[PDB]
Design a binder for this molecule. Structure first.
Ligand code: QW6
Length: 236
């Protein structure tokens, strides 16, 4: 996250860190708890991942340095990548992880709602991107989960900034005209969370940008509302 601030324990309880276990153990991607055995994340995360055997999902994490040999995590039973996914910038950048056991909900780990039936035309004005990603394009994964408030931009504006790409209705963009706050490397798969009527909803999944926090270059997110039927079908 560029231009963000440190989060505190319990602030973003749906946020997880997905680790790979081989050839080293490290953060791969963010994700969001959406049900008792379900993480919503980005399909791009699994490039070159041979099987679910090498994944671990850690919930209730503020600092990556909390993760030690005795830290509890969830195994991954199944990776469900959208059938149409090919490349982040071409869309369909969505995946589910089915966990090997159920998450017990606590102050530090809880699900986030999807965008609700009846809210298709809600104007979201309180949206936050979170993650352990870089603070600028050339950096490293951060220890403490970061947050930044980012305004949504229209698809029409977003398409004007990315004339080499097809910005579809299945994407949503967010950024400041003069840049300075954005997702960056290591934030992908995590949430763009928007609060409406004091309820948080998972509006986006951090997907791609051509840079981080550049002027007139909004971040591009998977538009979760356009995948609710897919998510419900896959999760039962
Ligand atoms: C290209 O745009 C991407 C991001 C992005 C998103 C927004 Cl909204 C706005 C701008 C950007 C940008 N830059 C965010 C994002 O995290 N990715 C990802 C893409 C990769 C592809 C392989 C599988 C993991 O994900 C990524 O760069 N992740 C990564 C990189 C390095 C490390 C590390 O040093 O340990 C760990 C994770 C890319």
């Amino acid at each position: 996250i560029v231009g963000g601030t440190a989060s505190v324990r319990g602030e973003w309880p749906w946020q997880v860190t997905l680790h790979t276990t081989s050839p080293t153990q490290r953060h791969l991607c963010g994700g969001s708890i959406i049900g008792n055995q379900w993480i919503l994340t980005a399909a791009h995360c699994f490039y070159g991942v041979e099987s679910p055997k090498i994944l671990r999902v850690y919930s209730g994490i503020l600092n990556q340095s909390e993760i030690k040999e005795d830290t509890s995590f969830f195994g991954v039973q199944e990776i469900i990548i959208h059938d149409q996914y090919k490349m982040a910038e071409s869309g369909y950048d969505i995946a589910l992880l089915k966990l090997e056991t159920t998450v017990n909900y606590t102050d530090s780990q809880r699900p986030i709602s999807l965008p609700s039936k009846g809210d298709r035309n809600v104007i979201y004005t309180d949206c936050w991107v979170t993650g352990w990603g870089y603070r600028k394009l050339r950096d490293k994964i951060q220890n403490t989960l970061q947050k930044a408030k980012i305004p949504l931009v229209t698809n029409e504006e977003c398409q004007k900034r990315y004339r080499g790409h097809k910005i579809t209705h299945k994407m949503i963009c967010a950024g400041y005209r003069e840049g300075g706050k954005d997702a960056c490397k290591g934030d992908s798969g995590g949430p763009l969370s928007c609060k409406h009527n004091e309820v948080w909803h998972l509006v986006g999944i951090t997907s791609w940008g051509e840079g981080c926090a550049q002027r007139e270059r909004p971040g591009v997110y998977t538009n979760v509302v356009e995948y609710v039927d897919w998510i419900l079908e896959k999760t039962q």
